[PDB]
């Protein structure tokens, strides 16, 4: 796929989000489509409605509140019309721009839709495994626990090109920690690094031939150090749209090309941003746009506000079934941004409709690991800080799966399968790098 932006196609995708949630709501709550009607017009009767949270003016103030939101309907639902929301009868809520929501309410007089109740979107199902599969996974590990290390760029500071800290880290994982898998998120060479941005790039006396491009700078600076990661540790690279080495600077972002990075096949895999995969039974959902920094909630209610922001935001992501549900995506003001390629938001949805067991969405906020709705949510933090001080990384240690220990749940059915209960078996440490 090329750099094309097509308005009809983008709008198709936004329409389809509303329609697919309309079907999820109808199946979960067992409602008939005749119970759904157009909230943008007057009725005498209470109706159910599904739509997208949008601002009530298209040229809107940076700071929204519960009196300045509208609901956008699908093309079939309300000819795409948008209607102002009256949220005065609802004491507890958290909304954000781009959120798909379901309401019970009424447009009494034509110009407002009064929300009487919020129908919460249901959490997606968790993946399951057969007893045979779990036994193989048990044999893979030879008793011992599964170890996965996760890092996120930047890897060098703002005022130099030192990877000394990364070398120290590599020595540690090779010779002490010895994990099974290492997941490394970009940026590797961040195009917005201030020396890169300004072109203040020095002569490197430790290179025989100077790089002429940022791609060559990666081959001379990162490749030789990455090559020293033990071949026994499988290493996964996931890019950022700020990666100078990527030529696909929109989310969702195609994977890097490993051969081009001159990294060895023996232990390096390049994955897309986002990507979903299993390590043994554990489903990972990885995405490298900063949802946790960017999602700006409009909030009412003491109970909602007393909760932790990171819990609320993780639940919004699980409910929305996409790793960056904010739309329009955030902008850094022009320098950088989410850079959403709206036509392909499809690929940023939860693969198979499954919630991940572990969800990793690096952020510039402080590192954190939290269980929310039985999903382990991890922000490993930046590997190095801009000043050159130690950053952090995440270590995930998961007890080896055991059908006999009880910690796996048998799901009832003719075909016997088990919920991984990764949250019950996983320990996440956030370690100074």
């Amino acid at each position: 796929r090329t750099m094309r932006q097509n308005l009809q196609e983008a709008s198709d995708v936004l329409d389809d989000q509303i329609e697919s949630f309309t079907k999820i709501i109808q199946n979960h709550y067992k409602l008939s489509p005749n119970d759904f009607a157009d909230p943008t017009i007057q009725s005498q009767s209470e109706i159910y409605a599904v739509g997208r949270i949008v601002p009530d003016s298209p040229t809107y103030d940076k700071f929204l509140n519960p009196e300045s939101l509208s609901l956008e309907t699908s093309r079939m639902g309300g000819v795409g019309r948008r209607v102002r929301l009256d949220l005065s009868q609802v004491n507890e809520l958290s909304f954000f721009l781009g959120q798909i929501v379901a309401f019970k309410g009424k447009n009494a007089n034509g110009d407002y839709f009064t929300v009487n109740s919020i129908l919460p979107l249901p959490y997606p199902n968790s993946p399951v495994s057969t007893s045979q599969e779990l036994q193989e996974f048990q044999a893979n590990l030879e008793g011992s626990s599964l170890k996965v290390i996760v890092t996120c760029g930047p890897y060098f500071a703002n005022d130099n090109f030192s990877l000394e800290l990364l070398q120290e880290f590599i020595d540690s994982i090779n010779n002490e920690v010895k994990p099974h898998v290492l997941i490394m998120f970009g940026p590797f060479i961040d195009i917005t690094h201030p020396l890169i941005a300004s072109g203040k790039l020095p002569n490197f006396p430790q290179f025989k031939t100077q790089p002429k491009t940022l791609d060559e700078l990666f081959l001379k600076l990162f490749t030789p150090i990455l090559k020293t990661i033990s071949p026994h540790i499988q290493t996964v690279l996931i890019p950022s749209t700020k990666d100078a080495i990527s030529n696909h600077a929109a989310y969702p972002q195609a994977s890097l090309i490993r051969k081009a990075l001159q990294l060895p096949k023996r232990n390096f895999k390049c994955m897309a941003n986002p990507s979903s995969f299993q390590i043994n039974e554990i489903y990972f959902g990885c995405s490298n746009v900063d949802t946790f920094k960017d999602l700006k909630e409009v909030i009412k209610g003491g109970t909602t506000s007393s909760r932790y922001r990171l819990d609320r935001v993780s639940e919004h992501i699980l409910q929305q079934r996409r790793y960056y549900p904010i739309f329009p995506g955030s902008i850094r003001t022009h320098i950088s941004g989410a850079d959403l390629d709206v036509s392909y938001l499809g690929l940023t949805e939860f693969v198979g409709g499954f919630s991940p067991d572990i969800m990793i969405i690096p952020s510039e906020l402080q590192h954190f690991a939290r269980v929310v709705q039985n999903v382990v949510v991890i922000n490993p933090g930046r590997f190095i800080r801009a000043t050159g001080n130690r950053g952090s990384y995440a270590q995930i240690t998961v007890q080896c799966p055991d059908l006999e220990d009880g910690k796996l749940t048998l799901v009832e059915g003719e075909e016997p399968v088990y919920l991984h209960n990764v949250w019950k078996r996983a320990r996440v440490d956030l370690i100074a790098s």
């Binding site: 090329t2 094309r4 308005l7 948008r82 195009i191 491009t213 030529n247 850079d339």
Partner: protein
């Protein structure tokens, strides 16, 4: 090519030693820089750019443009409305002003982006530099209009002397042009 680049914007380079900023128009006259026989040279402090010092900036500008493009600003046709917004109606072309009949269009069209990249490409195109077919960086009334004009034969010679630099600068644009 003339009309194609009429609305593109200049590639602005910053000098690694002294930080003076200037538009780069190819192997053409300028009061700020000189393409000498050993490379691109800053006229304020005489320091030579290395290739990485040039190409990192080319790439940075490209990516700034590509990021602006993905911000997805839209604009309305109707001269009596004109709103710019990033909101997209589920009917994409439809304007979000109550009752406005204008058509919405991406404000950074993909034609404009492609033209912007083709302009950058032209700057490092040897054949175009030699034939003197690049777009001028300065209008005649600009206070920075160049004081000395380069000769054709200087441009030919200087272009062949800097072929390698040009081609490497050009490859950085092509990284994104084949991807478009």
């Amino acid at each position: 090519d003339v009309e194609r680049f009429k609305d593109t914007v200049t590639l602005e380079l910053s000098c690694p030693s002294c930080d003076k900023r200037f538009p780069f128009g190819g192997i053409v006259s300028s009061n700020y820089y000189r393409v000498s026989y050993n490379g691109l040279q800053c006229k304020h402090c005489e320091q030579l750019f290395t290739p990485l010092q040039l190409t990192s900036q080319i790439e940075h500008s490209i990516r700034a443009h590509i990021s602006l493009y993905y911000a997805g600003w839209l604009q309305c046709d109707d001269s009596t409305c004109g709103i710019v917004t990033r909101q997209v109606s589920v009917f994409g072309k439809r304007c979000l002003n109550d009752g406005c009949t204008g058509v919405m269009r991406y404000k950074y069209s993909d034609k404009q982006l492609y033209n912007q990249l083709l302009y950058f490409d032209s700057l490092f195109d040897c054949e175009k530099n030699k034939k003197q077919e690049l777009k001028p960086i300065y209008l005649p009334d600009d206070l920075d209009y160049p004081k000395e004009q380069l000769t054709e034969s200087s441009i030919k010679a200087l272009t062949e002397q800097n072929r390698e630099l040009m081609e490497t600068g050009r490859s950085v644009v092509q990284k994104y042009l084949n991807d478009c």
